[PDB]
Amino acid sequence: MEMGRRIHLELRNRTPSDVKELVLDNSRSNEGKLEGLTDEFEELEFLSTINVGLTSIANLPKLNKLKKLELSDNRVSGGLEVLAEKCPNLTHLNLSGNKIKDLSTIEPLKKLENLKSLDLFNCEVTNLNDYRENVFKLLPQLTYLDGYD
Template sequence: MDLVVNQAFEVENRKWGYCRYHQPCDSRPHPISTPSTVVDTHNTTSPICIHSLPLRTPLDVNSSFTAVIQYPTAKMRLTADLIQSSLSYLNPLKERELDLRGHKIPAVENLGVAGPHDAIDFTDNDIQFLGNFPLSPRLRTLLLARNRVSSISPTLSNSLPNLTTLVLTGNNVAELADLDGLTGCARLTSLVLMENPVARKEHYREWVLFRFPNVRFLDYKKVKVAERERAQELFGTSAEPSALASKIMGIKSRTFDTTSTTNGASTSSTSKSYRVKLTEKERKRVEELIKNAKSLQEIIKLEKELNEGRVPAAAQGDDPMEE
C-alpha cells in the first residue's frame, strides 16, 4: 500500500513523546491496516511503531531529531471497528473529543456506536455530504476542515440540536443558499467557511448573518454590529426578505438527478436531487448502472447511496471497496 508523509514534527531536547493509545500497539488494533511509523533521521535507526512508545517516555533526552508519521492513502469506510479503535480524549477545552482525522472517510455512518461526545474531528477526510448523524444532543463541535463537503442536510439540526461550532475550512460549498441546511441550528455561534467557493461570493458575510443571526464569530473574526445592520439593510428579515434575498435563496448548486435518466422507471412525479457531486465520468457510470439495473431493488440501493453522500462503488474509477 502506498504511503505518504501525513505529518511531521520536531522533538527538542527533553521533550516528551506521547503514544496515540494508552497500550502498546500489539495489544490494541490499529484503525489502519499498515501501522504508522516513526523514522529517527538523527540517529538513522530502523523505523519503530509510534504506538509502542509508552506515555510520557522521552524519545531522546540528549539530542533532537525529526520524526515522520506515515499513513496509508486508501479510503476507509467509517465502520464500527474504526470508531471503537479511534482515540477518544479530553481536549484542552475539557470536551470529550473523538479523533477521526486522516482516514479518507467518504461518508458519515455508524456513529451510533461512538457514544456521547462533545466534539468530533473529521479533518482530512473525503466527506461530501454533511448529514446522516444519529441524535446527538451532547455534540457541540464538528471539525471538518479539508474534506469535500458540498451540501448540508436540511435535517441536520434535528440530529445535532446543540451544535455551536462548525469548521468547514477548505471544502466545496459553492452557493450561499447551500448553507440553508444550517438554518435550524439555533445555537450555532462559531462558523468557519474559509477556502470555500462560497466565501468569495458578494455579500457573503452579510448573508451568513442574515440566515444565522446567532453567529458571533465568522471565519475566526468577531461579528460587528455594523455588519448586522448592513445585513438587515440588504436582505431584510427572515419574515420579510428583500428581493435580493429571495433571488439568492433560489440559487443552489446543481446536483445529479437520476429521474431524467430512468426513462420512466421512477414512480414518483417529484424530481429528487441527490446530495453528492459527481465527476463527469462518475455521472455517466451512474446513468449506465440505472439503465442496466435488473430490479427495482438495485435502483433503490443506488438512490440510498447517493442520498447518503456516497459515490456507488461500481461508479468509482478505482477498485470498489468491499462492503
Template sequence: MEARYKVELRERDPAKIDQLYLDNCKTDKIEGLADNLASLDTLSMVNCGLKSLEGLPTLPELVIFDISQNELSSGLDILAAKCPKLEKLVLSDNKFATLEQLEPLKAIESLSVLDTFQNDVEDVDDYRTKIFEMFPNLKDLNGHDINGEVTEELEEDETGVEDGEDSDGSIDSDDEDGPGLSYLQNSNIMEDEDETEDYDAVEGDEVEEGGGEGTSTRRGVKRRHEGGDDEESNQ
C-alpha cells in the same frame, strides 16, 4: 472509518466518550459510529474525503464539529436534525458555493461560530453581511465578529501560551535560576571568565596532557596557547 472508530473507542463505553477524533480516515460517508454517543461534545473528521454526512448518528450534546478539508457541498440539513446543540462548525476547505447550501444551518439556533474559509461561497457579493443576516445568533465568522474585529476565541488561540513558557510548553530559560541562554551565547563573557578562572588555577605551573590535574587546569593552559602566549607560558 469504522475500524478507526473502534481503535479510538479502546473498549470504552460509547455513551461516556466526550471527544472523538477520526481525522484522515478516507471514506465518502460517515459509517460505523455508534448510536449511543450521548455525551460526545467534540467530533473531528478532518481530511476524510467526505462527500456526504449520511450515516451521522444523533449527537444530542455535540458542541464542536470540525469537518474541514473534505468534499462536502450539501447535506447540512442532517446537522440540523442530528446536532441540536451545535455551537461551533468548521467547514473550511470544502465545496460550498452558494448561500442556499448553508441555509439549513439556520435551524441550529445555538450556532455561534462558523468557519467557511476556502469555500467558493466566500466569493458571493457582500458575503459577510449576508451571513450575519442569515444567522442572527452568529458571533464569529472565520475568526471575526460582525464588525470585522478579531474575536476573543481567535486571540486566545494565537496568544494562549502562559507566561514563562515557550509555544511547545517548555519553560523559558530566562525564567530559570542561573544565567539564561543569552548569557551563555555571549562569547566575550565566556572567554573573559574562562581565562580568568583557568589562569588562576595554573598560576606559575605547567601541566602536561594526561597529568593528574583537573580538566579545568588543562583547559586553562590550552586557552593561553590559543591566545598567542606560548612563549610566556613556557618561560
C-alpha cells in the same frame, strides 16, 4: 486506515457512551459517508473528521450533546439540514475547505439555534461580494464567522 477501525483504535476499549471527544482525522470514510458512528455516543461533545474524503453527512446519527463539529478539508456540498436534526445543540461548526458554493446551501443552518461560530475558509461562497454581511443576514444567531467579530 479505515474510519471504522480508526474509531475502534481511538476508543481504546471504552464503551461509546463514555466518550466526550473523538478525533478521526485522516482516516478513510466509507466511500464518502461516515462509518461506525452511531447514536450510542450519547456523551459526545466534540467530533473531528478532518480530511476523510466525506461527500455527504446524510448518515449522521443522533448526537444530542455534540457541541463542536470539525469537517475541514472534505468534499461535502449539501444536506446541511441534517445538522439541526441530528445534533441540535451545535455551537461550533467548521466547514472550511469544503464544496460549499452559495447561500442556498448554508441556509439550512438557520435552524441550528445555538450556532455561535462558523468557519468556511477557502469555500467558494467566500468569493461573494459582501460575503460576511450576507452570511450574518442569513444566520442572525451567529457571532463568529471565520474567526472574526
